[PDB]
């Protein structure tokens, strides 16, 4: 059941940290 | 994109850098 | 000294959680 | 915007909702 | 309550607000 | 096996953030 | 300025983890 | 209580155990 | 050790204290 | 699929907190 | 007052994530 | 080392990679 709400929260921390001083966008949709 | 290619399998820092602004 | 790198990480957790099923963008720049 | 208006002072859920997509 | 109705399925911000003090 | 100890920690972050300046209680028991 | 909203979020993680299977209450007020 | 006695200074696991249910 | 004995089942604070320096 | 990268991150938080002022080591290997 | 207990917790998340499949050690002492 | 050189000032991923095993 649950897994997408927690899976999309573990990539945000490893997302802005990768770019560094830059930012990024996050939009889950097809 | 990141809600599936990396949500169903860990990825590398290089692939995650492609999503940077 | 440090404070902006930790101040921008405390709002990300309270950002995607606010929208909910929707996403959002984050770009620190003037 | 959010790196100053809320980084220098807590905000409310209503104000944070204005940044939603 | 929240250890099952929300632990077995994501909920909405409205339902989670009903648990506020 | 593990899943309740981690499932109850992902809701706490999205719990106090929902109320805001207010607080809340958390007691896993029937 | 900011500090109480982040200081009360660092104790929640070290609060339910201390009790363990038990729960606790959080209400910031005099 | 915990929003000042421990928010203005780290505490010990023993003191945090007194706030347990 | 901790990547299996506790990664496949929650443990207690006493067992986690044995991994302390 | 994913689960070890997130399982080893939930124990790090409950690792340094257990020791307290002391530190510890983390090496996932056989 | 508080700042080292929270400053040493923000580097652990950005520590094991940098190594990747490898691990690391953490010991705050002179 | 990391409890001061980076605890008193953000660092880069390259410097943090030097602390890898
Ligand atoms: Zn998780
Ligand atoms: Zn913090």
From Swiss-Prot, chains B, D, E, H, I, L:
UniProt superkingdom: Eukaryota
Disulfide pairings: 6-11
Name of the molecule in the record: Insulin A chain
UniProt lineage: Eukaryota, Metazoa, Chordata, Craniata, Vertebrata
Full protein segment contained here: 90 to 110 of 110
């Amino acid at each position: 059941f649950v897994n997408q709400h927690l899976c999309g929260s573990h990539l945000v921390e490893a997302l802005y940290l990768v770019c560094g001083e830059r930012g990024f966008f996050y939009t889950p949709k097809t | 994109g990141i809600v599936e290619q990396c949500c169903t399998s860990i990825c590398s820092l290089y692939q995650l850098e492609n999503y940077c602004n």
